[PDB]
Swiss-Prot record:
Organism of derivation: Dickeya chrysanthemi
Name of this chain's protein: Pectate lyase A
Disulfide bond positions: 291-319
Co-factor: note: Binds 1 Ca(2+) ion per subunit.
GO CC annotation: extracellular region
Transmembrane regions: none
Enzyme class: lyase
Keyword Transmembrane: no
Pathway assignment: Glycan metabolism; pectin degradation; 2-dehydro-3-deoxy-D-gluconate from pectin: step 2/5
Amino acid sequence: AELVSDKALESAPTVGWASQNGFTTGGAAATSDNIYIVTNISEFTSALSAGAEAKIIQIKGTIDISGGTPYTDFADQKARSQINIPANTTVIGLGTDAKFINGSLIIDGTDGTNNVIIRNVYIQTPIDVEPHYEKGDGWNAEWDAMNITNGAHHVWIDHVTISDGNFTDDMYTTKDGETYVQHDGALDIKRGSDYVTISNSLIDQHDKTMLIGHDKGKLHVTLFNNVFNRVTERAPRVRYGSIHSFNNVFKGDAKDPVYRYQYSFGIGTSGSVLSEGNSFTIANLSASKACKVVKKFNGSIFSDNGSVLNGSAVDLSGCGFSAYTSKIPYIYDVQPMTTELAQSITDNAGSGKL
């Protein structure tokens, strides 16, 4: 159809892992017949059926993954809400109101999927209609907002917003004396996926958000100019993989009524994190308790240079970790974190901000 988005055919910035050992161009090589404008899930799956052929799919308005039909149970939700994005695909939202609800976008490398760009779209985390009761311990929600799985490499998430939105956790009901959790993870990157860049995005209002690894020598993820607002934990929590996080904004409250801030970085098995010029504005978090932003699990590699906590340069080098030593293969400009920069990144973060 018609190319209406000015930014649709641009590829990932040369900065980031998604541009290492190959560039991430999505469907920029698409022919005129592989340019779409989709308004619903049927039109969306039809355009995606173009397979591994370069495709540009422009999202107009709200895409209700459920197709206006509520999921009857787990089986129904499992069969209808998971939309696979194939190789060489660019999903770019039009305007400021392009969004997805009631489902998950899946980049599955089982068919060899790689070279995917998801941009300028709001993904409201799906609600699991039938959570499973865990071993005497609360309810377990099953669905993601976005999952990168099975060797899927070269993925660029830019100006995307992921949020609980219309249904935040303060609205959870309790069943059998336990909170009926219907939200899962926000973004999961696992199973040997690799070469990913997440930029100018916003994760707003969510609990367990970003889990990387779930491997040795894979999972390279770069994150810059993103905002993590009222996010309980994992921004991200990594294992078997190195992440490069610089010039991001984390805003929370260690005593928030709904998404009480726990930590941002989770250092797991063979996981490494290079943090630089990040802004941490966490209410109820004492300057002497700054190492709370980094939580160790089974990993040991963690380094931070130039990050701030509540407006003051913080020293997160004595938190109990070994230095990040591997080199970053690409050049990048880490800007000094100031009140001005943190505010500007907050203005720019998320969908509708292209």
